[PDB]
Design a protein around this nucleic acid. Sequence first.
RNA 1: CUAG
Length: 174
Amino acid sequence: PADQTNRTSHPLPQGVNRYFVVKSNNRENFELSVQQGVWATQRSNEAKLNEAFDSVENVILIFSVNRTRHFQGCAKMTSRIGGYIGGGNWKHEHGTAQYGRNFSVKWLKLCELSFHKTRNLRNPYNENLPVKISRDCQELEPSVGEQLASLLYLEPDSELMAISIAAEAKREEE
RNA sequence: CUAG
């Protein structure tokens, strides 16, 4: 009874964060990311994630699979792109849009956040369009990013959350 | 990217 209420997701790190919407063409890659703690983006996006990674303590990546009408969670970018990381043999069609280098992520919160529920939120960095209209690695104006992440934390954990925590712990035993 |  001395034990604090134990938690099943990681809270949004405190401090000065930047926020990017990350898009996947398919669930398979997103699920692989969750099992392995790894992502890779399009080559053209790598310098901008590295610029964010160098600039602030936490780069928060809010994921959404194309066409699912939902956000699926948020991760912290935990390594700079460049440098061997490993994992992630990714699915893609006839070699097109071939992905860049794998980097580490830590899944903070996994859930299914409907776009309906984000419909009053717009992003000044993308012409004040609703945040659902976000290409891969579009930056969220940071006050809007913090609002969008806060909506994620209102949703119940999806089944992937515990999958993530388990995989994360397994990688920790070294 | 969102919509079909």
